[model samples]
Target chain A: SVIHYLWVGLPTKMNSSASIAGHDVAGPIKMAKALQSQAQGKPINPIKFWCLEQHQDFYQKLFNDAGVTIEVCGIEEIIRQESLRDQALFVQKFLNDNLPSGQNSDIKQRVMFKDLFSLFLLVCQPGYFLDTNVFPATDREINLPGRDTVATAKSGFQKSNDFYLMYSPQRNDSQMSEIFDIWARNPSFGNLLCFSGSHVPYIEIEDLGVQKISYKSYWGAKLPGLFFWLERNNRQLFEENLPYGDINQQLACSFSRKSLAPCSVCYEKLLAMPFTTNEAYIATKANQIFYVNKTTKECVCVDRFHKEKIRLASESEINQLIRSLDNFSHPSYIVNIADGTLLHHAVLSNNIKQVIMLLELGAKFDLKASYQIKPEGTVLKFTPLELANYLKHEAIATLLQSH
Target chain B: SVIHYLWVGLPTKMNSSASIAGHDVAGPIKMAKALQSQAQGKPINPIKFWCLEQHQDFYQKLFNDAGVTIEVCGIEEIIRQEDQALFVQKFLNDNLPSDIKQRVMFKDLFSLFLLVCQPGYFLDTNVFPATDREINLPGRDTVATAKSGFQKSNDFYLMYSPQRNDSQMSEIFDIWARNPSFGNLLCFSGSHVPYIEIEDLGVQKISYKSYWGAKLPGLFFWLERNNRQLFEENLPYGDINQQLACSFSRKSLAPMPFTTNEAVNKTTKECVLIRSLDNPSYIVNIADGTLLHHAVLSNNIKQVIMLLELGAKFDLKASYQIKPEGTVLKFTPLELANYLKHEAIATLLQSHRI
Candidate 1:
């Protein structure tokens, strides 16, 4: 029997960002959408989404629409048990056991707990491991013949993964047990290189079996598509001949950005992902709409939204777009992950026509663009007029102020 | 050394109740109050209030007002460990140990972990088991209170305070929780529970001079005399056979009453006579006539006059309500004497009163 495991390791309360595809989605939901694409025709397996037990209730409701197969596993209880608590009496007990001099930090203990927890999962189970960014073409066919799997990234070795790994061990396997003990005790330690196939390695694992299929279909193209919006001519001019191009984010090294919600394009694409229909009343912070069908116990994802009558809009795309914003909110509501508001982007890029079009469609004229930087805060904050005027775009500035 | 361990067991979400001592408190608060009363001048022991991690935030906020001495220990993380999980897999390894069933309801078996793994008293929050001042009692190594009921050496009381890890009682429970079986309930029994194993250990018993630990004398309620019922309401809800059993001196000598500790060098003396008509402990009767009411209930003419002469008021009215086994009765000394149908007491009261 095989299992599908997904991880919701971080607290998702405020960790939501626009998907590279433009949907305002929580990190876990983003992962779920990626997994949904891979599960097509795959043998059905109950998906285990390990999360904090305290978060299980809300996450269960959110993940109820995740798919028909995901199970929200609140693993906190296991991590805190005495037998398991005594397991790592390893570093923790040593640091402050009977005589506590320093408490390092709770999160430090939490991080160690995470390491032991992930390693513990591996020591007990044997299955192929994959990342949210990686997709599996055919599971059994892709697994290494006689060895387990391990993946390497450009950064340092982290965890036992080459995106795909298949490990089979005897129950209560002694060597695996010792390795974990030695690893945990030595972990002032690592996981990645221990299995790296050298005189350094003895266990079965293939460094090459993990196939990097096509970063093109998902993470690669989709992200650059919406997330960075990598453009060509930096000197190229826009509608106002205001000389601006290169729509890339500041690589987080210069300045950072945060989008308040998902854009229409991203939300539509999220809804378009294929699923057998099951609905639920799950609402996101952005107040995004989703359909929940109770009988199937499976949540379906697709574009035919509002499978209800009128909370949705017309068949005409423009009519639907306009009506989606007509009575309720700003047409520029979505801030794509670091992508600023529509008007905010247009004016900064010196797009007089785009700015005019945005205003004509109900984008507020008075809002400002905020450039998030560290230490202090928003490195630059300015209105459309202020940005256009400063960038020497007379036409854009003139266009924005007229409204 | 006898350690004082306090448990904040249940998630105090919506489940709370009034203490028998008339404090509008939750279960843990009721326990803390009892312990607070017992803690008078005893050496301070930081109370280990065991609770679930999830409810710690809420419970800690509430327990902060619970006096200056509780350390809330969130025990959920301990119950969820894989070794403990594997430990119990003795019963459930097959059906689905890899399921969320372990996550959600594991709190139920929380008591199981504490019982065999270590030793401490296991009393329900609702049970104000008339505890004596908890500290080191002389001539005792692993000694503590017994549930001391229809049977003694009770499971509901305490276990190894100083602690002997090798005891057969601990071993029996440890083996039970550690081993696996098919049915969850049946695993506990093996065939059935080891109550026999427990009863085999032979419990020690002692008289508990509790303040508000057990029920008041049956005769007080039976005689329908509101001894000190200043303001009585719906009866809300322990045990020495009686808390104020040996005396009504509950008015003067209350708070940390420690004669209850079975194997201890005693702390305070038990009550013999109540002096005041209203002290917190005595006025709990709510009728405001402590000694007079006790005298009336016992129907002792000499003690009645002795109490009256000693300044116990005769005309203090309770206006305390009674449900129909039904009758609405007003409380006064003369009224109770006449109601109990003690002819000499009533005639004696009439001649001396109006």
Candidate 2:
């Protein structure tokens, strides 16, 4: 049986609307899809999914249709026996598939180490962040809080999985040659499984003189001793997988691509940004409502779906949804708003007036056309009369002048 | 008659102790040395040089001593034109021979346009940011002041260049199927006159949609229209050089070679960084002072060097200079810091009580 490992950064539900994975931000979805599918030996393609957390409804909407094994981990999980093995597997698989064989050297291994280790560092970030720019302010206020929810979920994964230190995969003979080339050129090898729950993974291995250590050494103070073993064992790839759990939690930090590459474009449509204080471009439900974003806009859809479940009046619900609209970025903003409440609200109230009013109020007119909201080729703008006729709203004209 | 484009991001007094090329990023110093020693075709290269900036002292100290033709371009002067043909001729004749060629592509030309026209939409924002963490933020700060900075820089290169357009490059049939295929791919039968840069010396054409305007409509906008025409008629290389000027500014974003199929080790001394936030690493000053980054690290090496040139001592400049150390990431950071003021930081350390 093939074991699949996936790392996802869940965005905070309450504060940010922007997920930590969009092409503009870093395309986490694309990166994830690329990794997942590419690892399976498929044509390297792009991911349509947005922020993993925000797209819950997108997944739930067609829940069982998608099939991909995914797990979320923190810096603490890096050294855990299972997590270490899984991560090592992911790293080796990625390297073997991507890098050329003969060209491989210690320097190249360092790059691979840097790239793979960066993934853990990126996930450990408190909330999702990208390398493009700060999450819009509006997205932060609503979606940022939910990142903790995902971390909380990972906490459950950590408990059942059992986490702590294990062997480095490169210790294997097959892996050693490539790594040795890099070691020969560099001064030392070091790894820092960065844990401050507030931060991401930052693992490095360096030359710290010479000393011998065993599995026991990787546990604590012996952790440093493990360095000497790496220096001595010097063989190529250690075939077995080693797990690392019980890592430390360090400081909270904003994610940077140069600091961590994978995290930047890990997702495609949305991002689960991890940053506090700098709530810059947090888009709202409406932001995600835009055409291309419509398929996966989550929180916005759930909020309205829940409201409808409560049997809230369509007008009142629309108004409440409008308040949330302020947080959305353009194109997706208006589209997400409609996806959350407008489509249903407009139909429920049998009033095309609402459509006209929102438009007159400068609601996005070209959104659908711009974002490719529907595969069916739907248009974005509509007049009250046009929508009324289209929906067959018999009483819509009567409500038009109710103001 | 040799045409070598020496794109130099030379250092102004404004930048010191760092790379002479606008900022002490990388690539420049080595290029300068190679040209000076006329070491273009030499094997077992004694030095590593790719462009005109990098290794400041090495440029002023060693390469200059070796009679290198340093085509100094002030950071701002990159957009200026001082007789394109003359500049191209002078650069190529001295530093490069007639047959010499650098590995560049038409895709690079289009990519430069994309970067110039749209910094956020087409170009990767994480490549250039004020602070390192800002490099990896999401969706882009639509209204951030830095966005404006990126926009202006993009416009400067796009507007200053004299190339016709992508389509124009398609017409040069005589050169197609010839030594450099680009002559036909980029130029038509009627194309003539002074090419703006030396890099244009090497060009061939391909039949594919330009990746530069991948998202933009199929060649509609005014700027794009003009650009296509410029590519056809003049076939200028100035735009390419302008992009070279901005390469180092792109930060440490060199190609991640894994895609080519290389083996990777789980442990190596390469710097390990987290997302957005910096994991503090230490670097000792010349005086052996254990420096702590009390503040966030700024990517602005030029600014720091400027401050140093103004007589700001390392102690006073710690706010911007010192980066925390303790982690392995500190290795490169220490090397870079020491390289900046090797004598000063080292001297300071030697003077200190060990």
Candidate 3:
């Protein structure tokens, strides 16, 4: 008998263009494949796919091919299955009578259905009911390790669930069923479930020892901007090796590496911006985009004198460039294809700040790089020290010598 | 001394057509009085009025009467004098590129810079801290869509505490700075009001559940469920309520269709196009690319972080317009960064992968 189950949602007619859980990743397809192909154990992954109807066409075929179970049950049918039938009818009437006249007369009655459905499925079926952001790397991973205790994944360092845990392998709870009754009577909480950037209830279920899998292993790379970085930059790994749906949306929906650290180029970009209105920019296109040195303290735009002047940047301003480089995974990474080492670029730049930035980011000096004086000549080699000597930048020499 | 500054960056000597800061809520004047009166401790509240020069005569006199400190700084001369001359030359700059036909508003940049400088509350000049509906009808379109008796103050009220808001606040600032239209998203001259559109704050139908009651229209419509009609039925043509609906209808023409994500058609999976900060590909008959490509192009750092969480593949290549005039280029997000000189985004994309 299948001891564990993986229930994933497939909204009707999901197209290849859909960025998530659709054809882009063949969400349920891959998930189902991973589940069925897992190692044989006490609990082999028995994946189930749910949809609005039997018309998920390709989705159905994919699930069928893999021997996955699916249901055509939507909100009303599930509501009709409840022991207290009027609870569904009474709430149904309110949606019809009160809703303003608009499009989607059918969905108007249909509340967003993730939480209520997950809760109900767990009570009746009692399995690993996952958000579509999930794809198990192995069968045993979602099998609650040895026993069916509560579990979830850390979305890096937050309380949300791109990586949610649950009572696994047919672990049932009547209290969880009570939650279904609550939603059955009140369909409103369903709408909030629409936001993938939402909370999970399992972590708070502390009576049972909950295992929040480490971010690095379970679903931690999941940060505010989940796989957007990998999907965009590391497209290969993303397609071949994306794991745990950033471990869940809200868990990963923290802040970004940029926002977390925080400028350079921002100043130049700022100085480069039209201090005046677009109206001002339009009138003076070529001739108008210039600024005058107002007193060496600042430069005021010629278009709108004092009202628009560029002055000294605050600490937040100068560091704008360095702040952008918050995540220094490779302290030795001096930009790929080997442009130069950190200190090589720093000392010559002579803002003490860049050197300080690299140092703060745990940089190692005394690294070597080729610096050709001539554009076409063989590149000359120099350690981090020789450059300051070659340039005769005394302050740069002094700083490194002190170390 | 506990000091609060009324930072005003004027939009070039406006003779005033109505509705700039200092006009509606008497922003500058009212703030000065409130801060001065609310001073609770060491000088309780000391107000500092800062501007480019000493030319804001009206505000100067008001501050002087209130015994406030006024600084005549455009940022350069003053900070550079404090030996921050290097800071002036290096960090932060003027607003637009000569090649750009449009200008990113300096005032918007200034507000963001203020936030970047430190966490504080930002109440717009027109935003009423306390709202008596008769005074500021900020909820007209969503809350009172049926009645047209008032002018809605469609400004967002922001309060940030550094404890939890560091990244969230910066995320918002990135949108405001990068995306040109975000500033006028809430209130503007006949704009469709993104407050109503983007977030589904429009008049939705009877969205109720057993836990709560009828939700016809208000803030949190999509989250809570549904809403009802704001206007009353059978109002006479002469009634102001009739004009209210007229105003709502006129401004409500362009709407984001969130009402229909329920049915699975060849349409949106989520109300929001998830992968991109915006710009969903395959919508048009064009060779668009991945979510990482989208976020990098938009220069949205936060969304890039978000894409990272979803596992945005950074190395994927997509060839798109480097310039609207033509010259389509092909490259990954890093390559694009190298070309466009988006140093920050490049730093983010390259660090992990490099």
Candidate 4:
């Protein structure tokens, strides 16, 4: 997935000029269209420009001349019509608490207010907020990994045939509930960092079909992606290095220039990367996405695109993720850390649907995954079906029997 | 301490009513004055009533009729002028579909907004002075009306008399117990007729008082009305305060109200400061001097971090004096952790130093 074209604008009063790629741009409206054309058809949402108070004729004529349908809006008008008292209160308190004392200039404070307000707007409603000067690669897709994984964004992961939506069941989903509770109480910095990891669990609820529940994990990428874009384009605007700066800087800096070789992990350079995929890599054996890497002595996955090393999920955590997946694609290869061979750890947990999904994904039934009884002694081997039957996982055993 | 009359209003179309005391009162302009009257002349700061749309004439006439001045504001106008563009607009459109009907909830939120927007402001409309005459209180520079009749005391005290009327009992209790002066007595009775004694120190004179009542009839009757089981159990001997002390010890007052140190100190020690009663000798079951002793006992790493952050005097000795059951007198938090055999906690304690 990629941003085909994006609407970009800045809050301006009267006339404004901005520096774009070392060139002096006449106005924000002109600059927004110039940047939008660079994205081709990748920007998925309508383009909008916000100004504090400005006459619309010249900008309208400019947009029309460029043959773009970018919309114009007054910043004050948007705030007047859209802001809720609750959020307004929250924002007011947040600004008062976080702002520096010495910085008392009206223009600077207004700019700062607009920046924070933009963040709140995008978080509450899914949309893109961009600087007018930032341009995109017309032919390339920016890989925005984990973007689609967030259940709260883009209406969650859905199945076309039925009204199957993903959600952490209101009860029994303790981890997501804990994270949500933390946000509710503080709404402070660093608490939101928990959303960066990809382990939040959700169940696929099929409202139209037997109300069947399937498990899956969601990664909150929308916020990180938005932050990444902002930091990458407007580095100077965030010199204060707020709590979000580190993660944003790391992500934005990860985007590589085109003509450079692909990142060893993701096989794509930054310029052509998809705007929706995570920059990190996940490597699996036997369709298992999580494991301890014996060679590297680290629990990790890989991507040629993402350059940073990360702490990988443990076996149990991976098992939890796999358990939650209502739908999963099987990896083409499977190997044991000690010995190279196929394995089925899922059958041991005993979910009929999971076993069926694995089978449908071409998991071989007869292939044995061996475990050594002793360091220098005899090894034991068993296929997934055999393991399921021996472990008395009747449902999985029954499913495997038919397969 | 005071709310100067200022009318803040929300922009609403035509007729709308704010529910006050379950009565349908048309327009917040009227409601603001009604709430304002409760505070009387005691309101210290400008009173503001915020509304979404403008209705100037009726509000102006209302304020004029009442001989009180108020500032009427259109909520949308305020947002347009005062708010940052993106957030207030988007959030309102998304969260508040019918902004007029939900204005009451908005009013609740508006209090928080006002507090942030103005540096020094209080939003509670229920505020009023306990006494008609103005008096100076400790920690505040302003000579405002005293909130209560309690005389200051050093140690915590509770006063009550079965014979006195409710208001008289409260007034005497406030003067004798609510105000803290330097003296250590557990409880007091209003029947003793506690007098305020002024200790002059040249330029300034500090008033002090002391009183005692083991029974604490106020808590006794309160317990009888609210907590029947404990009241009945302790009623035979008329040992209400003693029962309260026992409940404090057993952690069972109103579901063990003193679950935290703030509550413990506030109720038992007369230490009302947030960080007061950092060390409680009576409940020091696992005490080493450091606050970490309790944290280590619970094995809650986060609690240990919290104690450290609260300036827990990390390097101080954990002694038997702090806790009756404590065997060691001079062990550090790390030593306590080591004794309990919690390596992680021991490591944490070792790392933390005041």
Best by DockQ: 2
- The C-alpha stretches of model 4 lying farther than 4 A from their native spots are A1-44, A53-67, A83-89, A92-115, A131-133, A138-403, B1-354
Superior candidate under TM-score, 2 versus 3:
3
lDDT of each: 0.37, 0.25, 0.34, 0.32
**Distance (Å) between predicted and true CA of B124, model 2?**
18
Write down the C-alpha DockQ for each prediction: 0.00, 0.03, 0.01, 0.00
Residue-by-residue lDDT tens digits, candidate 1, A22-83: 11123234334444554478643334556556557755766665453456665545445534
For each candidate in turn, the TM-score is 0.28, 0.19, 0.29, 0.18
Worst 10 residues of 4 chain A by lDDT: A252-261
- lDDT tens string, model 3, A42-122? 445455555433334554565566465543233344455664223434434543464434222222122234444555555
Error in Å for residue A353 of model 3 = 30
Tell me which of candidates 1 and 3 scores higher on TM-score.
3
| Stronger candidate by DockQ (3 vs 4) | 3
**Interface RMSD per candidate:** 35.0, 21.8, 22.9, 36.4
Chain A TM-scores, one per candidate?
A: 0.44, 0.19, 0.40, 0.28
TM-score of 4: 0.18
lDDT of 2 by residue, B1-354 (tens): 111122232222222111122222222332333333433364321222223334345444533554344432221223233222232333324433311111122212322322222232221111112221211112222211111232221111111122323232223222322223111123222443222221221111112221111211111111123343422221111111111001011111111234332123233333322232232222222111111111112233443333234332343222111222111112222234453334443444234324
lDDT of 4 by residue, A218-289 (tens): 111111212322333343432211211121111111011111011112211112222122111333332323
Q: Write the per-residue lDDT of candidate 3 for residues B242-339, one digit (tens) a residue.
A: 00000010001011354543422222134332222222111110122444554565566765675565444677655443111112244676876665
Fraction of reference contacts reproduced per prediction? 0.00, 0.07, 0.00, 0.00
Shift in Å, residue B309, candidate 3? 52
